[model samples]
Every structure is written in C-alpha cells, then in structure tokens.
Target: RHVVICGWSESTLECLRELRGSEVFVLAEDENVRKKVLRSGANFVHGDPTRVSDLEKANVRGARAVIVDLESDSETIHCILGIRKIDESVRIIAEAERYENIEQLRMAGADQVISPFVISGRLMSRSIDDGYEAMFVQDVLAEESTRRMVEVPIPEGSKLEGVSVLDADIHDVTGVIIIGVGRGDELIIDPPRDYSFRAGDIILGIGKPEEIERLKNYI
Candidate 1:
C-alpha cells in the first residue's frame, strides 16, 4: 500500500486528485482537506504526520511507500525522520519549497524530494521557450501500462557498461527499450552503435514497471 501525506496546501489537493483510484492511503490534519480527500476515495487518517502515534494510527507500518507533501520544510523533515525511525524500508518522496532544502531533506532520510514550483517553472519555461523539447520530454516521461520512463545508474564493474546498444540484451531479458542517457550535462537521445555507458552515466529507458525492475537487477 502507498501512504500519501496531504499537507493543507495548494499542491496537496492537486496531488491527491491525481492519486485518486490508486492504491493510496492519505493523511490530512485539516477537516476541510480531509473531506476533500475522502471524496477522492482514498483511505485517510486525520492527524499530524510528524507525531509517531498519529502515523501509527494511519497504519504507516503497512505502507510500502510514502509521499510527504508538507508545506513547511521543518514539518517535512520531521515527518521524514519519524518515518525513517519507524520503517527505514519505506520509500519517501518529500516536497521541498526551496532548492536549498533538497540536501537537508535527503539527509533526513528522504528517498526523493520534489519541488512543485521548480518543476512547474521548468515545464512552463520549456513549453513557452522550447515547445517541441517540452513535448518530447513530457512524452518520454509519460506513464502507461506498456511504456514508462525508467532511470538506472551505472554501478561499478557492471557488465553492461562497455556493451553497445545492440548487445545489451535488454529486449531479450527485460523487453525494455533504451531511450536516452544522461551523463553529467549532456543528454544522449537514442544513442547510436558506438554509445558506451560510462561509470556515472544514468540511463533512461522505456518499459513496463516489471521490466524496468528486472533491468535494475542487471544494471
């Protein structure tokens, strides 16, 4: 099951709306927001997420993943730490208002941190300034049953590093397609025959979630 922290903020409602019909459990302190969250048809608990008892009441132990969408940086950090204390295995995706807080959130044990404002600003800039690139990025990131973006980092001594795209055996094993590679500042879209993965390269592929997870085992 998934646990969603719904801070009483602008993005919280939108995020909750998007998570509707998914396997999600919500936590919202505000009664008004709780009403809206319940209307979305997600399991919800009304309490402060920073408190251990409240999180326990929300059945946080059963949660496989959590999205911490608190507005304040302090609250977000507190919640992340608390979750780590309870279950370090649970994946946490936190929200940070400021870019400076990103590292702090990660240090507090957040697996991923999302800045809604930053993402929206970048999307808007790309849409207005670079329309085609924005569309391409959106299409590449889009999620579906058959196709979705998968990111895998090259680990040390990986067998697939020096292998060419044709010899990667990705289609045979995982049935996924390698779409792009991000090495430092450069983005290689659909690398050709000579493309070799460097140690620090982050590959972006397209496939089903199961296929992507299988590919992770090899990478």
Candidate 2:
C-alpha cells in the first residue's frame, strides 16, 4: 500500500503533498529530511538510498514503486542499481538534472527518467506564449532560441500559403499568436500583418496546449 520514495528533494515533497489515496514511505540519510517526512505524516526510515541494505529495510521488492530524485545524477544511478537488482518487477522513476543523463539513467535500470530542467523549459514555453492576438511585434527572428516558440512546417495543399498574416488570421481563428515564419535559411520575425505565407515555410506560434492542437488541425 506504500510507495517507496528515496533521496528527498523539492519534487519529492511536491509528490508527497499530492498523494490523496496512497501511502508513501521516505528513505534518506538526512535527519532533517526524515524529520520533515515524519511531520508530513509519511512512514520514514533512516537509511542511505544508494545501498541495498537500506533498500531491503524499505522492502523495495514489495512496494508499488520506487521514486528517486537525488541531488546528483551519480548518486541517482547508484540508487537505481541497488533497487533494480533486488526487484526487477517494481517500477523505478529516477530524476536526472541533465537531459543527456536520461538514457544513461534508464540503462541503469530506471523505468522512467525525468529532468526538471527540460520539463520546466517546456512548461515555460506553454505558459508565456499564449495570446489571442499577435504579441507586440517582438525581436528580430530569434538569432535564435526555442525558448517560447514552436516551429511547424506548412504542409503542401495547405490553405496558409499565399495568404497574408492579416488574411491568414491565425490568431483570429485559433486563439494563438504567430511568432515568425521560417523558410530554408530565411526567418521572418513579426512579418507585416499583411505578409503572405510561402510554400514549405515553417510557422512559429504560441498558445494554450489545446489551442495549439486546434491550429494544428486547422492548418
């Protein structure tokens, strides 16, 4: 009935706060972390997550899942290996600080790898880019970045080609803002509202996730 959580972090606490119908058990070497978990009403065990003996104490093989968000990718890998050896069937979700560490962590026996850096970046893109109309014409074509933009190719037979941004009226139609248009090597940032679409040009836009889908199917 309990999920085993290892290596306390902010994300670990967030998860604990979200549990409504399940029980959680926290394992860590930090007295402060253990104290917090105890205060949060979770079962707490004092142990080093990177060792099998501590995992055994937590009964890693019997829990619903083992989640780890260690301070370092190296320690995260160490913890994952200890659990996988003892329980191949249990789910393991380990966090990595770098996107590049995801696959390597998975190979070390993590069933899933999450990177807060990448997750936050993508979430940022979704949040700041939502607008019903074009934003005040911004900077020149990103010299460049993917920070708040999504690049989409204008498919052949598409209706957007040859249509002016005024007539293309994506914002009026879909509740999103077009950030720019990119061709082979040319980028048109804040092209005139009257700017016409070209075949094969990539359309850059921002909107709520569902509005993005609406624009996707509308185009």
Candidate 3:
C-alpha cells in the first residue's frame, strides 16, 4: 500500500526525501512541485487537495494512509474531511499549523494531528533537562545510525500470537525493547506486560538493525 501526501512544504519535502524507496504520491497544484516530487521518486498528481476529484486523481481511495501538510489549518482540515468521505477506514495524518488547531483537525476527521511548533517546543526544552534524549532522537532519525525504530505486524498462527508481552520476553531474547503495540488504528504506547499479542497487531520497538531483524525472525 502506498502513502498519499497532500500539499507541499519543507516538512513534506523532508518526508519525500526520507521516503525515497517507498511508494509515495504527492498531490499539489504547483507545477514546480510536480518536477521536485517526480525527481524525489514520488508520483505527482496536480490538483487542489481539498477537492475530492483531485484526491481521486492521486488514487487516495487505494492509499493505505494520507498525510496532509498544508500551511493553513483550515485547508488541511478541509482536505482531511474530503479524504474521510472517500475512504472512511484509511488513516489520515494532518499537521496543524498552530498548536491550538490540533483538536479541531482531529474533529475534522484526521486520525493523527501533529503541530510542529508544539513538538519542537517540547523537544527544545526537554533537551535542556535531558541532554541524551535529544541525541537519541537524532540517532534514530539519522540514515546511517544503526539504532532505529521498527514496526512489525503479527500474522495469523505466528509464534507471538496470544503470547503476553512478558511471556514472550522479547527484549531479553532479541535485545529490542518494545515501545508500543498497534491494534487496528489505536496505538498503545508502553503497553502493559500482560497485554497479549493478537493477529493483525503491530509491535513497535527500538533497537539496532541486527537486533530488529533477529526480533522479526524470532517472532
């Protein structure tokens, strides 16, 4: 499944840059964006993201997820509503220009609403108190860093199915610390030890590349 990104900005450009190998589609009215998106290895669909017909041009209905990165909260909210109307189940990730607009964006049918200022503000202050936290985040975002985050889905009849987090002893066995569990669209961060793995549930973890691979094999 491919990811459809709506609008264009520095954040959108960074996503396009980092997601070179993945299937990505960009919806924008600017001709300049078409050139940049294509060169960045993402499909380009020229149109207003707030329009349903424009979203259809980008095959948003077939997309697994949609990312709305507009400069205006109203535009992003309108685009998210249009996307939801087309596909109720598809995940919509919207970025709110202002921190106060996050709730409104969520109300407008966005599954996840992120505010860049709020995130950066927290990180900036947190770095002062916990110096290593900033460095750890940098490492995970770095392309050459071995320490990375991973999400692996548990398939039917897998060894992990029905196994509790503590019972599996994943961290001890594979050296990959379980960070969260994703069931359907809900993400449970730091899931309880008694939480059992179910088919279709995704396990989120942080570890070295080799450890992540080993964990995948072990499960």
Candidate 4:
C-alpha cells in the first residue's frame, strides 16, 4: 500500500508534501535531504538507494511503487535493476538526465522514465509552435495515468468531436475505455449516453501504453 521514493530533491520534496497523508517512505543518502524529506511528514530511511542491502533495509519489499529520483543516471539505473531483481512486481519510476537513457532505464526494468530537461524544452516549444491550446493538451497528456489519469484533448475539428462515447467506437480501434471527461474544470465520470465530446474538452482513458497511443491518433 505504501510507495517508496528514493532520493530527495526539490521535486521529490514537493511531491512528498503533496502526498502528505498518503503512505510513502523516503530513502535519501544525504542527511540534509533526509531532514527535508522528514519535514514533509513522510517516513525516512537514511542510506544510498543504489545499494541493494540499503534498499532491503528500507523495507522496499513491501512497497507497491518505487521512484528512483537520484540525480545520477548510473545510480538510477542501478536502483531500478536492484529493485527489479529484489521484487519483480514492484512498479519502478526513474528520473534520467538524458533522454537517450530512457531506453536503458526501461531495459533495466523501470516501468516509467522522466526527463526534466526534455519536458521543459517541450513546454517552451509549445508556446511558440502551438500556443496556449497546445500547452493545455500537453498538460493533459503528461499527467500520470495512475495518479490524475490520462487526459486526451479533443482538439478543434477533431474527428472525435460531437461523437457519443458509445458511438466513437474506440474499443475496436484502440481497446481503451474512456473513464471520464473533463469539460472546462468539471469532471464527468462514466458519462451518460447523451454525453457529447467537444473541442477543448479532455477525454480521460485508461489502457496500455500502445492502446493509449492508438487512441491518441484515433482522434
């Protein structure tokens, strides 16, 4: 039921603060980082996350998820591999400095990989290329499906516009289920038959990675 977060950076500390009452255990090598993590109200384990024994001592075996936030790619990869080797079912999310290291992280058994630089660059590009609308689309798509869920925007003039959830025929095309709809700031879960898709509205779907990609293009 608890998630184990390895490393305590500014982003990790921010995340822990938001997850305040939730079940999360923080693993950090630095004493200062450990103090910061403890201040966020999460359980703390002081040790290098890259070490298998250190992780074991942190009670990682009981964790449902593991986040490798180490600044170094080598340490992140090592942690990912170590977590996978210790407990195959524990979901792993890793942070990488370089985009090219994503595939390596995946090969090392990381379930998800995030690159801060690439994400920042993409956000900057969206401003000039697609403007504010594209930024909204990017925000929706970038959200964690397991957390806030995946939001796919129904762009202006999209083929999916005006289509009912049942009639959109997404199951056959992408095998994904539309879990909800975001109309402005409102969220409608499992909408009724009369529910309609509109421009600027976001469709929240849950499915495999390839299925989500297929549905993204299906719109």
Query: Each model's RMSD to truth, in Å?
Result: 5.8, 11.7, 2.1, 11.0
Clashes of each: 0, 0, 0, 0
Q: Relative to the unseen true structure, what is the C-alpha lDDT of residue 72 in candidate 2, on a scale of 0 to 100?
A: 91
**Tens digit of per-residue lDDT, candidate 3, span 115-184:** 7788788789988766787787767775567888888888889998999988999999999998899997
TM-scores, in order shown? Answer: 0.66, 0.58, 0.89, 0.64
- In candidate 3, list every pair of residues with a backbone clash: none
Model 1, position 81, has a per-residue lDDT of 86
* lDDT: worst 10-residue window of model 1: 137-146
Residue-level lDDT tens digits of model 2 in 103-158: 88999999888787885676566557573222322212232322245567888888
Instruction: Write the residue-wise lDDT of candidate 4 on 1-219 in tens digits.
Output: 888999888767766766767888888887766566677788888898888888987778968888888877888898988887679988888888888788999999998888888877777776775577554544444434332235689889999889887788776788778788889758898888678789898888867778878888998
- List runs of model 2 lying over 4 Å from the truth: 130-219
Model 2 residue 13 distance off true place after TM-score fit, in angstroms: 0.3
Candidate with top TM-score is 3
**Best-to-worst TM-score order:** 3, 1, 4, 2
Error of 3 at 83 (Å): 1.6
Model 2: weakest 10-residue lDDT segment is: 132-141
Candidate of highest lDDT: 3
Model 3, CA-based lDDT = 0.88
Alpha-carbon RMSD, candidate 2: 11.7
Worst 10 residues of 3 by lDDT: 136-145
- Give the per-residue lDDT digits (tens) of candidate 1, residues 86-147: 78888888889998899999999898888877877887987875587666665555554356
Better of 2 and 4 by TM-score: 4
